[PDB]
Amino acid sequence: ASATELLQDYMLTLRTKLSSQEIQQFAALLHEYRNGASIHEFCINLRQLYGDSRKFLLLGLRPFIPEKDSQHFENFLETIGVKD
Structure with a gap:
């Protein structure tokens, strides 16, 4: 499964959990x-946006983080408790 495909699946998932405004906040973050x-x-x-109650959705962003930032991201996930 390509990143393109993964991102389409991910956005389909996010639209079931985030509101219209949150989805565009997400878009703008991924853009910056x-x-x-x-x-x-x-x-x-992202943590602030998703909030505690949706934090496990953050696992799904793995495929979109460039290798250079992978360690930082995994450490982030560990810190907020989605890798407990």
Whole structure:
């Protein structure tokens, strides 16, 4: 399964859990990040957006994080408790 396909599946999932406004917040975050914003900022903002109650949806973003930021992202996931 390609990243393109994975992202289509992921967005279909997100639209069942996030509101219309949250989905566009997500889009804008993924956009700032793909354009040079730091992984630290991306992660903290995602956490705030999804909130505690939807944090497990963050696992699904794995395929979209570039290898350079993979360690930071995995550590983030561990820290907020989605890898417990």
